[PDB]
Subunit: 143 residues, 2 copies
């Protein structure tokens, strides 16, 4: 998540032991029944894309579902780009995120926090969560 | 955390998503042992106000919720006993020390709660109240 330090700067806060413990428990009991989704939504509150990837990579078992989820995320990232055209570089010299930045694969943790705390926010955590949930909805059909 | 109109990241109260998940946990698990890890994670970063919202969204379990209120009253009284204070801050505009009733959120405002939680060093009133609530839950789980 994101927290303010003693200097007043926004910086990363590691997913806590209590949050990761609960998410594992939810995965162990519910992955990937419909009931997993409200639990994921709450436990991922304030997550950066890097935190969201940590949560996804905690899922033990469910190899096939995790592959489908990844395919959905890849699709959404590419569509995001097509619906959010940008110039061939910052005119500057903050770049707009691409789909792969939103999914955490091409962006740094600092870029993620930059977007999420920009004025107005470019809510890359919330956007990635929407793609993840689209995927979870597809996967519930296997369960 | 949420961004205000001035572009600042400030505290925001317990969210609809968090509360919806908490309900669902109550509906399935209250107050079996497995409620406690879920309460602990869902209340991460909660103020005393957020924690009283969680407690007051439990439907039923009146016996349990009465035991919780007794546990909180006792821990608040013991907090006051074990944290002796002066009558008030010696310096004029200085932040007062929280008493038990401040930690339980009955005599403190949201502003004060956030003031303590973000002090340097923190006075983590949300964590303290959560400890009292979990102590109550560990008694109550014996009924379930
Ligand atoms: Cl976000
Ligand atoms: Cl706290």
């Amino acid at each position: 998540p994101i927290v303010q330090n003693l200097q007043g700067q926004m910086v990363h806060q590691a997913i806590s032991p209590r949050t990761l413990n609960a998410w594992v428990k939810v995965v162990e009991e519910k992955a990937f029944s419909p009931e997993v989704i409200p639990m994921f939504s709450a436990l991922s509150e304030g997550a950066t894309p890097q935190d969201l990837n940590t949560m996804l990579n905690t899922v033990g078992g469910h190899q096939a579902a995790m592959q489908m989820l990844k395919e959905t995320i890849n699709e959404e990232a590419a569509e995001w780009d097509r619906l959010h055209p940008v110039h061939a570089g910052p005119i500057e010299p903050m770049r707009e995120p691409r789909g792969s930045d939103i999914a955490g694969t091409t962006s740094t943790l600092q870029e993620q926090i930059g977007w999420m705390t920009h004025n107005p926010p470019i809510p890359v955590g919330e956007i990635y969560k929407r793609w993840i949930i689209l995927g979870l909805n597809k996967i519930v059909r296997m369960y």
